[PDB]
Amino acid sequence: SDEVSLYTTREPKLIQPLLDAFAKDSGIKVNTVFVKDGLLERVRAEGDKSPADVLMTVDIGNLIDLVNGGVTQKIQSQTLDSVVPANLRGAEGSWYALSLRDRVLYVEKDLKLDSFRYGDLADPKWKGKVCIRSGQHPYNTALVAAMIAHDGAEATEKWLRGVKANLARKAAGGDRDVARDILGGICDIGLANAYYVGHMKNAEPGTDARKWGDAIKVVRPTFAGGTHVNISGAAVAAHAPNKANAVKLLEYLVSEPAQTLYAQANYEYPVRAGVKLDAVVASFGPLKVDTLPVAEIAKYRKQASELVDKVGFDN
Numbered sequence: 001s002d003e004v005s006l007y008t009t010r011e012p013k014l015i016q017p018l019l020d021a022f023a024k025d026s027g028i029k030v031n032t033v034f035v036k037d038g039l040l041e042r043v044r045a046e047g048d049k050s051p052a053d054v055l056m057t058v059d060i061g062n063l064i065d066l067v068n069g070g071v072t073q074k075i076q077s078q079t080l081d082s083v084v085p086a087n088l089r090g091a092e093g094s095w096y097a098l099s100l101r102d103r104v105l106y107v108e109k110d111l112k113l114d115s116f117r118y119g120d121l122a123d124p125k126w127k128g129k130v131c132i133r134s135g136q137h138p139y140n141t142a143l144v145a146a147m148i149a150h151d152g153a154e155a156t157e158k159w160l161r162g163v164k165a166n167l168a169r170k171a172a173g174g175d176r177d178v179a180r181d182i183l184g185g186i187c188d189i190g191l192a193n194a195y196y197v198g199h200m201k202n203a204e205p206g207t208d209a210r211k212w213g214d215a216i217k218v219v220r221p222t223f224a225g226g227t228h229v230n231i232s233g234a235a236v237a238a239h240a241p242n243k244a245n246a247v248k249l250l251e252y253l254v255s256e257p258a259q260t261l262y263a264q265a266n267y268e269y270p271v272r273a274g275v276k277l278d279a280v281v282a283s284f285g286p287l288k289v290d291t292l293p294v295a296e297i298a299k300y301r302k303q304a305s306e307l308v309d310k311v312g313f314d315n
């Protein structure tokens with residue numbers, strides 16, 4: 001009755017403040033396990049006696065590995081059912097989106113560039129000018145997976161090769177390192193999540209993070225077609241010892257107060273309507289979402305990852 005356990009790939013500073021707010025509101029302690037990756041391996045290796053209640057990812061692919069991997073159970077909740085859009089959830093409560101995010105182009109603030117198509121990143125004119133993290137990170141495999149859904153595996157492999165040839169340094173680091181390396185003059189552009197820009201641009205003045213943020217502007221590419229969007233999402237673990245408290249945490253996270261935190265503290269987009277965005281995030285302009293369902297993007301996640309490997313993307 002007294003606690004709940006969260007296993008997640010989320011950044012602690014990007015989830016802790018609303019677990020704190022939940023505990024302070026509910027009286028329910030949130031035990032916490034953060035993981036770089038391998039969420040399915042840890043949950044399945046712990047077996048029947050696993051303490052896991054809630055499993056939280058920052059990628060639909062990752063989320064569906066868990067559902068289709070047999071380590072989840074269905075959720076029955078009128079609140080999640082009424083609040084979360086039917087295009088951003090699993091059938092009969094198998095999984096739910098909690099926030100939205102878009103993978104966009106970081107651009108040196110003074111570069112002339114109003115528009116971008118995702119395909120443009122392969123264009124030879126960007127040679128030696130692109131920064132990106134590992135092509136095997138879920139943010140990217142999902143993006144690659146959507147491109148497979150739009151253009152086929154042949155065109156996607158070709159794009160990956162063009163992108164790899166355009167890279168200014170090795171595909172590694174995190175999303176923030178794109179803004180860093182743009183400030184350092186290593187690259188002029190790079191693919192990364194816009195919510196980090198909101199996080200960096202609001203950072204303490206004088207800090208590196210702040211300088212990175214003030215170096216760049218956001219350009220949202222479209223598919224040659226809207227901007228690619230992914231989710232943070234959760235499922236309840238198959239043998240959750242605290243299922244009721246697990247559902248309570250998820251219901252709390254889709255509430256207006258918590259979705260405000262997603263907007264104003266995480267700089268993401270809420271799944272719930274009527275929540276105001278952060279002023280900096282609002283300044284990127286209106287978001288035109290890719291029509292492709294997130295569950296459809298997940299279809300090609302495995303092929304996406306093989307293609308990234310095939311081209312030796314991180315070499």
Ligand SMILES: [Fe+3]
Nearest residue numbers: 011014058193
């Ligand atoms: Fe993230």
